[model samples]
Target: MLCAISGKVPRRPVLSPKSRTIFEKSLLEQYVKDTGNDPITNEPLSIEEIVEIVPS
Candidate 1:
């Protein structure tokens, strides 16, 4: 399965749970700040919230 998917010019999702990029952490923080709530549930964002955001 892996090799079948890994053909020439392979493409993949940039924002996934197992992967981390340079801006991932900070971007999530900004998203939380912008929405002023939990991203998934839309509940009020708590102090020191933790969420994942992958910037493009």
Candidate 2:
């Protein structure tokens, strides 16, 4: 999938509840570390709260 934050393809891809956006788990984790909220929905989010998805 693609990162909603970066608006392009991403690595360590992951998805979250409430917000139907896929983001790079690795980079997004750190980004959340800095933002404390999801960029897509602008809601509070944690790295562990997101779920993994198969690209295939």
Question: Could you tell me every candidate's TM-score relative to the true structure?
Answer: 0.34, 0.71
Compose the digit string of candidate 1's lDDT tens values, residues 1-56.
01111222212312222222222333445555676443344556522543233335
Show where candidate 2 strays beyond 4 Å. 54-56
Candidate 1 Cα misplacement greater than 4 A, ranges: 1-23, 51-56
lDDT of 1: 0.35
Q: Per-residue lDDT for 24 in model 2?
A: 78
Model 1: clashing residue pairs?
Answer: none
Model 2 C-alpha lDDT per residue in residues 4-35, reported as the tens digit of each score:
76765775778878567888777677778887
